[PDB]
């Protein structure tokens, strides 16, 4: 609103607490986003790992499991999704 | 807000784009209503008799 002005700050101070609740609402929104992400994804208590040898009767999950080569440890489909949207 | 007046339009000109952002919401609302109707009713691919 004021951009580093003493006169503007003094003039705005007499308007009362208008923007304090705005800052509170923005902080609440950010906390809400964090809670949304955490509650959507953190559905498990531990971290599991697939066995190194995989023989699932014929089904092939290589396209969905993460690839050890990539440092991001993101699978092919995840890589495509990340690259598509920017 | 002007009723076809030049002075009113000139005075409003120095307010920036309240009007663009205002009009940008009604269109979204209308598209939302159309999507609501389409998703509620168009649950099938063919028409039976």
């Amino acid at each position: 609103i004021c951009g580093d002005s003493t006169e503007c700050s003094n003039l705005l101070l007499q308007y009362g607490s208008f923007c304090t609740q705005l800052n509170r609402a923005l902080t609440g929104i950010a906390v809400e986003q964090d809670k949304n992400t955490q509650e959507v994804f953190a559905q498990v208590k531990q971290i599991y790992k697939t066995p190194p040898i995989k023989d699932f009767g014929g089904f092939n999950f290589s396209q969905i499991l993460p690839d050890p080569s990539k440092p991001s440890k993101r699978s092919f489909i995840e890589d495509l999704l990340f690259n598509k949207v920017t | 807000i002007c009723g076809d007046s030049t002075e009113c339009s000139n005075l409003l000109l120095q307010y920036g784009s309240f009007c663009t952002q205002l009009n940008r919401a009604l269109t979204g609302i209308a598209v939302e209503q159309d999507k609501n109707t389409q998703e509620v009713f168009a649950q099938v691919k063919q028409i039976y008799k």
Partner: protein, 35 residues
Amino acid sequence: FNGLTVLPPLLTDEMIAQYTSALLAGTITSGWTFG
């Protein structure tokens, strides 16, 4: 009016009635299979 406009809906009531008639005929004749 006074600068306000009302836009007509994309889907007419006849098409909505046609959807409902098709759905009802399907559920009477086929059941849950057509879903």
